[model samples]
Target: MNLKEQLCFSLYNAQRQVNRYYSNKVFKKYNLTYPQFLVLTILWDESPVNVKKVVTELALDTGTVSPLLKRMEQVDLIKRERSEVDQREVFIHLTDKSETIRPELSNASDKVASASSLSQDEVKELNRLLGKVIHAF
Candidate 1:
C-alpha cells in the first residue's frame, strides 16, 4: 500500500482500538456503553434536553440514539418526558443516580488522558488540529 493509505489505516485502527479499550474499562463501573456515557455527559451539562438536541450534539441518527435512551430510562439513569411546549418532542432528563456517577466518570476520563503520552500542550494542539479537520467537513 501507499504510505498515505497505510498511515490512514493505522490511524483509524489505532483510534478504534483505543476507544474500545477505554470504553470497556469505563463501562464496567458505569454500566454504560461509550455512547451512553456521551449522552449522559450532555445531560449533565444541560439536562432536560430534547431527543433532537442529543441527536444533533452526538451526530447520531434517531434510530440509533433513541433505543439507547429508552434503555437508559429503563435502567433509571435518565427520564424521558414529552415536552410541554411541543408534545411531539421528547426530553431526556438526568436522574440523581446519573448525576452521582459524574465524578467517577470524570476520574476515568482523567485516567485515560494521563495514559496518553501527549503533554498538555500537545493535547491542546491536537484539539486545534482535530477541530480544523472536523470543521472542514
Candidate 2:
C-alpha cells in the first residue's frame, strides 16, 4: 500500500480497536453496548428529548434506533411518553434507576478518559484540530 493508504488504514483500525476495547471493558458493567452508551450520554445531557432528536443527533435511522430504544425500555433504563399535544411525537425520559446510576457512569467515563495517552494540552489541541474538520461538515 502507498504511505497515505497505509496511514488511513492504520488510523481506522486503531480507532475501531480502541472503541471496541472500551465498549467491551467498560460498557459491559452496565449492560450497555457502545451505541446504548452513546444514547445514554445524549439522554444525560438532554433528557425528555424526542426519539427523532436522538436519531438526528446520532445520524441513525429509525430502524436502527427503535430497537435500541425498545431494549433500553425493556431494561427499565428509560421510558417513552407520547406528547399530549401531538400523539405522533414520542419523548424519551431516563428512569429513576438510570438517573441513580448516572454518577457511576460518569465516573467510569472519567476513568477511561484518564487512561488515555493524550495529555490535557494535547487533548485541547486535538479537539481544535478535530473541530475544524467536523465544522466543515
Candidate 3:
C-alpha cells in the first residue's frame, strides 16, 4: 500500500483504539463523550471563552461544536449566553457541576499517560507529529 494510505490507516485505527480507553475507562463515569472531554479541557483552562475560540482550538467546524455544546448544556456541564456587547457572539461558561470535577479531569490526563506506559520521549514525539498534522490542515 502507498504511504498515504498507511498513514491514514494508522490515524484511523489509533484514534478508535484509544477512543475506547478514554471512553470506557475515563470518561464513562463522568458522562462525557471524548469530544466533550476535549472541549472541557479547553474551558477548564479558559472559561468565559467564546464558542468561536473552541471551534478554533478543536480545529473543527462550528457544526460539530454547536451540537456538542448543546448536549453539554442539556447535561448541565456548561452554559452559553450571547455576548453582552455583541449579541451575535456566544460565550461558554462552565457550571458548578463541571467545577466539581475539575480536579478529577486534570488527574485523568496523567492517568491516561501513565496507563499507556510510553516513555516521555515517545509521547512527546507522537504529540509533535500529531500537532504538526493538526496544524497542516
Candidate 4:
C-alpha cells in the first residue's frame, strides 16, 4: 500500500519517463539515444579523451561504457584509437558527423526545459540538493 512513498522508485520512474520522452521526440531526429547524447557532450567538451575519462565523468564502469562506445563507433559518431605510449588506453574522438550536428544537438534540450516547466533558479536548487543526495552515500 505504501509502495508509492518510496523515493528510489519515484526517481527511477522519473528517469525512465524522461529517457523515453527524449528517445521518441528529442533525440531520435539526431539518430541518438539519451545516453548516447550524454556521451556526445563529454566528447564535445574535450575530444581525444581517454576512455577512462568518459567512464569517470559518466560515473559508469568500463564494462558498461565500452560497448556503448563501440556502438557509437559503428555508427560513425565517434572514433576510438589506442594511445601510442599506452596500448591499453583507448581515446575517443568526435567525428565530422558529430561535429557538424553540434549546434542543433546542443539546443535539443529546450524541449525538456519547456516541458518540465522548471525555471532556472529551481533547476539550480534541485541540482544542488541532488548533488547532496548523490554524495550522501
Candidate 5:
C-alpha cells in the first residue's frame, strides 16, 4: 500500500484512469476502445501503412496488434491486404466507414483534454514532459 505513492504507480494509475475515461465517456458513442482509437489515429495520419510500421508506431508486438487489426477489420474500420511487391508484408487501409467517421473521432481528444482541466500551456508542457519520459524508456 505504501508503494502506491511511487511515480510508477502514479503514472500507471493515471494511464488506466485516462483510458477508462476515453472508453466509457469519450469513445463509447463511436464504439471504439481507447486502443482502437489510437490505431485509427495512426491510419488517419497515413493510410496504406504497413503492419510493421503500425506495430512500431504503437510500440506493440504483432501478436497484440494482429488481433486488434482483426477486430478493426470485423468492425469495417480498416482492410488489410498483402502487398503486391512484397507478399511478406501486409498493409492496412482505411475503409469508407473509418473515413466517414474521421471528423467526429478527430475531436475526441478535445473531450479528454477538457476533462483534464489543464490549461493549454500546461497540456503542452505535460506532453513535452511525457515525451521525455517515453524517450527515456
Candidate 6:
C-alpha cells in the first residue's frame, strides 16, 4: 500500500528520535529527561514562582508535576521553599547547580538544532509554522 500523508508518522518518529538523542547523549551525564529539561527552561525564564504557576506553564496537573518537582529538589536542580504566609504555597527556585548546568544544556540544544539541514532562517520559519500548527488544534 502507498500512503501520501506521512506527517503524523514523521512527527511521532522525530519526537521519539529527539528524545532518544537527549536521553542517550545530551543529558546522559545529568540523568534528566526531556520533560525535566522543559521544566528547567520554565524556571530559568522566571524563577521564584510558585508551584501552581509552573503547573500552569507546563500544562500539567498538580498530581503529575508535583512528584517531578520533588525529585528535582532532591537532585539539587531546584529548591522548594514553602511560603511563610501561606504554607500551602511552595515557591520554586533554581539551585546553583542548575545555573551552572544551563550552558551545557544550551550546547545540547544547539547540537540538536544543527543536526537539521535547514538554514537559520528556515529554522525560524519552521518554528513559526509549528507554533501555528500547535495553535490550530
Clashes of each: 0, 0, 0, 0, 0, 0
Candidate with maximal lDDT? 5
Error of 2 at 89 (Å): 1.3
| Poorest stretch of ten by lDDT in candidate 5 | 104-113
What is the TM-score (0 to 1) of candidate 6? 0.78
Which runs in model 6 stand beyond 4 Å of their true positions? 1-4, 86-88
Q: Ranking by lDDT, best first?
A: 5, 3, 4, 6, 1, 2
Task: Show model 4 residue runs off by greater than 4 Å.
Answer: 1-5, 108-111
Q: What TM-score does prediction 3 earn? A: 0.83
Mind giving the per-residue lDDT tens digits that candidate 5 earns over 68-87? 99999999999999878988
lDDT of 6 by residue, 1-137 (tens): 33335767766877788898788875778888887887787777776778887787665864887898999999999998998999888889989988877876755545767897778888788778777866785
Q: Candidate 2 vs candidate 5: which has greater lDDT?
A: 5
Model 2 scores worst on lDDT over the 10 consecutive residues at: 104-113
Task: Tell how far residue 92 is off in model 1, in angstroms.
Answer: 1.3
Global Cα lDDT for candidate 2: 0.75
lDDT winner, 1 or 2: 1
| Stretches of candidate 2 exceeding 4 Å from the true structure | 1-11, 107-113, 124-137
Error in Å for residue 23 of model 4 = 0.6
Candidate 3 structure quality by residue, lDDT tens digits, 21-40 = 77877677888787788778
Q: Rank all candidate structures by their TM-score, best first, as comma-separated numbers.
A: 3, 4, 5, 6, 1, 2
Error of 3 at 66 (Å): 2.0
TM-score winner between candidates 2 and 4: 4
Evaluate candidate 1 by giving its C-alpha RMSD to the native, one decimal: 2.8
Q: How well does model 5 score by local distance difference test?
A: 0.83
C-alpha RMSD for every candidate: 2.8, 3.1, 2.7, 2.4, 2.5, 2.6
Q: Alpha-carbon error at 118 in model 5, in Å? A: 2.6
| Model 5's TM-score against the true structure | 0.80
The residue pairs that clash in candidate 5, if any, are none
